[PDB]
Short mmCIF file of N, CA and C in Angstrom, two decimals:
data_model
loop_
_atom_site.label_atom_id
_atom_site.label_comp_id
_atom_site.label_asym_id
_atom_site.label_seq_id
_atom_site.Cartn_x
_atom_site.Cartn_y
_atom_site.Cartn_z
N UNK A 1 2.25 -18.44 6.32
CA UNK A 1 1.86 -17.59 7.43
C UNK A 1 1.39 -16.22 6.98
N UNK A 2 2.00 -15.18 7.54
CA UNK A 2 1.64 -13.81 7.19
C UNK A 2 1.88 -13.55 5.70
N UNK A 3 1.30 -12.47 5.20
CA UNK A 3 1.45 -12.10 3.80
C UNK A 3 1.21 -10.61 3.59
N UNK A 4 2.25 -9.90 3.17
CA UNK A 4 2.15 -8.46 2.94
C UNK A 4 2.93 -8.06 1.69
N UNK A 5 2.86 -6.78 1.35
CA UNK A 5 3.56 -6.26 0.17
C UNK A 5 4.66 -5.29 0.58
N UNK A 6 5.56 -5.00 -0.36
CA UNK A 6 6.65 -4.08 -0.08
C UNK A 6 6.29 -2.64 -0.39
N UNK A 7 7.30 -1.85 -0.74
CA UNK A 7 7.08 -0.44 -1.07
C UNK A 7 6.73 -0.27 -2.54
N UNK A 8 5.96 0.77 -2.84
CA UNK A 8 5.55 1.05 -4.22
C UNK A 8 4.92 -0.18 -4.85
N UNK A 9 4.29 -1.02 -4.03
CA UNK A 9 3.65 -2.23 -4.51
C UNK A 9 2.15 -2.01 -4.71
N UNK A 10 1.67 -2.27 -5.92
CA UNK A 10 0.26 -2.10 -6.24
C UNK A 10 -0.62 -2.82 -5.23
N UNK A 11 -1.72 -2.18 -4.84
CA UNK A 11 -2.64 -2.77 -3.88
C UNK A 11 -4.05 -2.21 -4.07
N UNK A 12 -4.96 -2.60 -3.18
CA UNK A 12 -6.34 -2.13 -3.25
C UNK A 12 -6.64 -1.16 -2.11
N UNK A 13 -7.42 -0.11 -2.42
CA UNK A 13 -7.80 0.91 -1.44
C UNK A 13 -8.78 0.37 -0.40
N UNK A 14 -9.42 -0.74 -0.72
CA UNK A 14 -10.38 -1.36 0.18
C UNK A 14 -9.73 -2.48 0.99
N UNK A 15 -8.61 -2.99 0.49
CA UNK A 15 -7.89 -4.07 1.16
C UNK A 15 -6.39 -3.83 1.11
N UNK A 16 -5.88 -3.05 2.07
CA UNK A 16 -4.46 -2.75 2.13
C UNK A 16 -3.67 -3.93 2.70
N UNK A 17 -2.88 -4.57 1.85
CA UNK A 17 -2.07 -5.71 2.26
C UNK A 17 -0.59 -5.36 2.25
N UNK A 18 -0.28 -4.10 2.49
CA UNK A 18 1.10 -3.64 2.51
C UNK A 18 1.78 -4.00 3.83
N UNK A 19 3.10 -3.88 3.86
CA UNK A 19 3.87 -4.19 5.06
C UNK A 19 4.62 -2.96 5.57
N UNK A 20 5.44 -3.16 6.59
CA UNK A 20 6.22 -2.07 7.17
C UNK A 20 5.32 -0.90 7.55
N UNK A 21 4.06 -1.20 7.87
CA UNK A 21 3.10 -0.17 8.25
C UNK A 21 2.88 0.81 7.10
N UNK A 22 3.00 0.32 5.87
CA UNK A 22 2.82 1.15 4.69
C UNK A 22 1.36 1.56 4.54
N UNK A 23 1.07 2.32 3.48
CA UNK A 23 -0.29 2.77 3.22
C UNK A 23 -0.66 2.60 1.75
N UNK A 24 -1.91 2.21 1.50
CA UNK A 24 -2.39 2.01 0.14
C UNK A 24 -3.10 3.26 -0.38
N UNK A 25 -2.37 4.07 -1.14
CA UNK A 25 -2.93 5.30 -1.69
C UNK A 25 -4.10 4.99 -2.62
N UNK A 26 -5.27 5.54 -2.29
CA UNK A 26 -6.47 5.32 -3.09
C UNK A 26 -6.35 6.00 -4.45
N UNK A 27 -5.33 6.84 -4.59
CA UNK A 27 -5.10 7.56 -5.84
C UNK A 27 -4.14 6.79 -6.74
N UNK A 28 -2.89 6.66 -6.29
CA UNK A 28 -1.88 5.94 -7.05
C UNK A 28 -2.12 4.44 -7.00
N UNK A 29 -2.92 4.00 -6.03
CA UNK A 29 -3.23 2.59 -5.88
C UNK A 29 -1.96 1.76 -5.69
N UNK A 30 -1.21 2.08 -4.64
CA UNK A 30 0.03 1.36 -4.35
C UNK A 30 0.43 1.55 -2.89
N UNK A 31 1.42 0.77 -2.45
CA UNK A 31 1.90 0.85 -1.07
C UNK A 31 2.94 1.96 -0.92
N UNK A 32 2.47 3.17 -0.63
CA UNK A 32 3.36 4.31 -0.46
C UNK A 32 3.55 4.63 1.02
N UNK A 33 4.33 5.67 1.30
CA UNK A 33 4.58 6.07 2.67
C UNK A 33 3.61 7.14 3.15
N UNK A 34 2.86 6.84 4.20
CA UNK A 34 1.90 7.78 4.75
C UNK A 34 2.60 9.02 5.29
N UNK A 35 2.52 10.11 4.54
CA UNK A 35 3.15 11.37 4.94
C UNK A 35 2.36 12.04 6.06
#
């Protein structure tokens, strides 16, 4: 079914597949918390 990533999980700035409403930092390139 669904598929997402956790926290501090590497991802793509063009395709954010993070969970918990996380954010894919285009800098660190990971699922961080949108401040």
